[PDB]
Amino acid sequence: ALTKSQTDRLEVLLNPKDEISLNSGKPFRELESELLSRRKKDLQQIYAEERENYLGKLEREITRFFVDRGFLEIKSPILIPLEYIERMGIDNDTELSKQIFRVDKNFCLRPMLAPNLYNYLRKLDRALPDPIKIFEIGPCYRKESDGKEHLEEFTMLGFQQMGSGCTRENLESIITDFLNHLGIDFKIVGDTLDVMHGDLELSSAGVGPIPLDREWGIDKPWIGAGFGLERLLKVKHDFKNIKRAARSESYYNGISTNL
Amino acid sequence: ALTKSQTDRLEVLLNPKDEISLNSGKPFRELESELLSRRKKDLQQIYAEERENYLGKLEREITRFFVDRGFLEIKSPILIPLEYIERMGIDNDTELSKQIFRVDKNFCLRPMLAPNLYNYLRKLDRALPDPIKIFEIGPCYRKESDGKEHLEEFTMLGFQQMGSGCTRENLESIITDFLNHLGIDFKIVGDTLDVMHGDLELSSAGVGPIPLDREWGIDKPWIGAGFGLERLLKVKHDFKNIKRAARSESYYNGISTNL
Numbered sequence: 179a180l181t182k183s184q185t186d187r188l189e190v191l192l193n194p195k196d197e198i199s200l201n202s203g204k205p206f207r208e209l210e211s212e213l214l215s216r217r218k219k220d221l222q223q224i225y226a227e228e229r230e231n232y233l234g235k236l237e238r239e240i241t242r243f244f245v246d247r248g249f250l251e252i253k254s255p256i257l258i259p260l261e262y263i264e265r266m267g268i269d270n271d272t273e274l275s276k277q278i279f280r281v282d283k284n285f286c287l288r289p290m291l292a293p294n295l296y297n298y299l300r301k302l303d304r305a306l307p308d309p310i311k312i313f314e315i316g317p318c319y320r321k322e323s324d325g326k327e328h329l330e331e332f333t334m335l336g337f338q339q340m341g342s343g344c345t346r347e348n349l350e351s352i353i354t355d356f357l358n359h360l361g362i363d364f365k366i367v368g369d370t371l372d373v374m375h376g377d378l379e380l381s382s383a384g385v386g387p388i389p390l391d392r393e394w395g396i397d398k399p400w401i402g403a404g405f406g407l408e409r410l411l412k413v414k415h416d417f418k419n420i421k422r423a424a425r426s427e428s429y430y431n432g433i434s435t436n437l
Numbered sequence: 438a439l440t441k442s443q444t445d446r447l448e449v450l451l452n453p454k455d456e457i458s459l460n461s462g463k464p465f466r467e468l469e470s471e472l473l474s475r476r477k478k479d480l481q482q483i484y485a486e487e488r489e490n491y492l493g494k495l496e497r498e499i500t501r502f503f504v505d506r507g508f509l510e511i512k513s514p515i516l517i518p519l520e521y522i523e524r525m526g527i528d529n530d531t532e533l534s535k536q537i538f539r540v541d542k543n544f545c546l547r548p549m550l551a552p553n554l555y556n557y558l559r560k561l562d563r564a565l566p567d568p569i570k571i572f573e574i575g576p577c578y579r580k581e582s583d584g585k586e587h588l589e590e591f592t593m594l595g596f597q598q599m600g601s602g603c604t605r606e607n608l609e610s611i612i613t614d615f616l617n618h619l620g621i622d623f624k625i626v627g628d629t630l631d632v633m634h635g636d637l638e639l640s641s642a643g644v645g646p647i648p649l650d651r652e653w654g655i656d657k658p659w660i661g662a663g664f665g666l667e668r669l670l671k672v673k674h675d676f677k678n679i680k681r682a683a684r685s686e687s688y689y690n691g692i693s694t695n696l
């Protein structure tokens with residue numbers, strides 16, 4: 179009989195498409211040696227052929243989708259003024275107020291893309307024709323309890339359109355084309371809306387105007403959404419724990435690096 | 438005569454390829470209105486045609502170069518254990534010890550890619566054939582004095598090869614092909630080596646083994662280098678201040694967003 183500690187070790191080496199059973203009559207050492215051989219082989223094939231990181235490749239694939247749909251690619255600061263958090267309405271009564279990674283006295287690691295996207299919408303409205311379509315992909319940070327669906331360091335896609343054409347129908351059409359392009363099953367549940375894969379939230383989306391817009395100098399309708407890239411990878415590759423998709427020293431494209 | 442404050446404002450709106458002179462006999466308001474029209478036009482052309490961010494596009498171009506040369510694309514944590522800094526030999530007698538952005542009690546924003554690349558080399562040596570070639574591109578953080586060549590939030594390319602073929606000649610060949618591919622003039626000065634554009638350091642490169650390797654479980658020869666992406670963009674686009682190439686709310690592809 180395998181110990182719990184031994185089964186934990188084998189599950190680190192198990193990939194979703196393996197057809198091995200750990201309740202066999204086979205000893206630990208031989209199940210471990212079999213899985214180690216498979217995972218080394220998996221890494222050798224990546225190294226010999228594609229050599230691309232899942233998280234990097236997904237960001238590039240999403241970038242192409244949105245650029246091709248007419249959205250401007252934004253790269254904005256990850257380390258942001260702490261004042262942005264309060265100005266987002268994130269006060270002490272919100273869960274999120276307790277999740278902020280503070281840096282020095284007046285800064286923090288951004289937990290979301292919305293402040294920077296608001297600022298870009300306001301500034302670009304002085305220069306670009308209506309409607310204004312922008313998106314950003316990059317690191318975001320939140321303190322979280324341990325859990326199979328949460329990382330403290332993750333990657334968010336955020337997109338926003340401002341001006342004409344900002345209807346819930348158009349928002350759902352973007353989400354639907356996007357996820358059908360990536361090959362990810364979803365349901366939209368609902369002006370706020372969540373994009374669900376079973377019980378897992380892939381995105382929260384919204385339709386403006388909302389009262390918060392005024393604090394950011396925004397006074398036009400808008401639609402937008404935010405997606406976690408590691409949650410998309412978790413669903414696409416059927417990972418049991420989102421740690422397999424993270425920026426990590428422990429996994430490469432979902433393969434354990436502790437071999 | 439323009440005030441100093443007015444000339445500062447015009448220089449925000451000036452792009453390197455403009456052929457306007459601010460020592461003309463033209464009033465500020467009309468020089469400002471001319472430049473504002475040009476910069477709005479520049480943003481409209483980006484939005485209508487390419488829509489890609491300089492920093493994102495450069496990262497994708499560098500990724501293709503290194504993947505095509507046989508290097509594995511790594512995406513590792515930006516928020517790293519504080520212990521990694523000391524283990525890199527960064528003690529109190531180094532400038533860098535005073536430049537760390539600490540987060541909570543045991544973490545920091547990485548100021549370099551070397552700790553994570555060392556860890557990946559050690560782990561992948563159990564699985565991949567010799568030689569092991571890896572690279573990473575992503576955010577790095579250092580407290581800096583104000584200066585036209587430094588950002589507190591920047592983007593570093595780091596690459597490393599371990600095992601056979603780790604000669605200074607091979608290292609210089611990688612650097613030379615890389616920068617000739619990007620179209621960036623350089624000189625290599627020198628086992629340590631710096632890649633210079635005039636007085637600007639584009640890269641520091643190195644040849645192992647070195648004594649530090651043992652602390653990271655490394656005992657094979659290696660070559661590698663680290664490049665700042667914003668410095669590469671600064672040189673390529675002839676920006677006067679690296680702020681024009683940064684993750685920013687103030688500039689988009691070097692164009693002022695304050696129009």
Ligand SMILES: Nc1ncnc2c1ncn2[C@@H]1O[C@H](COP(=O)(O)OP(=O)(O)NP(=O)(O)O)[C@@H](O)[C@H]1O
Pocket residue numbers: 320322327328329330332333334379380381382404405406407408409
């Ligand atoms: N800690 C996290 N790790 C990974 N992805 C995350 C994390 N927090 C948020 N996301 C993703 O970012 C998207 C937009 O952020 P947000 O709607 O604020 O998440 P959320 O409401 O906190 N979801 P949840 O924490 O699971 O109830 C979410 O739909 C997730 O896909």
Ligand SMILES: Nc1ncnc2c1ncn2[C@@H]1O[C@H](COP(=O)(O)OP(=O)(O)NP(=O)(O)O)[C@@H](O)[C@H]1O
Pocket residue numbers: 579581586587588589591592593638639640641663664665666667668
């Ligand atoms: N603050 C910064 N802003 C932008 N790029 C940077 C910064 N610090 C380092 N880099 C880049 O990262 C590369 C590798 O890091 P490193 O060799 O440690 O820089 P460095 O020695 O501090 N150069 P410098 O600070 O100008 O004397 C450098 O060659 C630069 O191109």
Ligand SMILES: N[C@H](Cc1cccc(C(F)(F)F)c1)C(=O)O
Pocket residue numbers: 290291292295335336337338381382383384401402403404405
């Ligand atoms: N669901 C969002 C993610 C998000 C990204 C970009 C824009 C927006 C917008 F303001 F459009 F809703 C949201 C969050 O975490 O705030």
Ligand SMILES: N[C@H](Cc1cccc(C(F)(F)F)c1)C(=O)O
Pocket residue numbers: 549550551554594595596597640641642643660661662663664
């Ligand atoms: N010049 C380096 C940048 C760097 C990146 C990746 C690897 C390495 C290596 F360990 F190869 F030298 C260095 C620094 O800042 O440490």
Ligand SMILES: [Mg+2]
Pocket residue numbers: none
């Ligand atoms: Mg949450």
Ligand SMILES: [Mg+2]
Pocket residue numbers: 379381382
């Ligand atoms: Mg949500």
Ligand SMILES: [Mg+2]
Pocket residue numbers: none
């Ligand atoms: Mg320095």
Ligand SMILES: [Mg+2]
Pocket residue numbers: 638640641
């Ligand atoms: Mg240096």
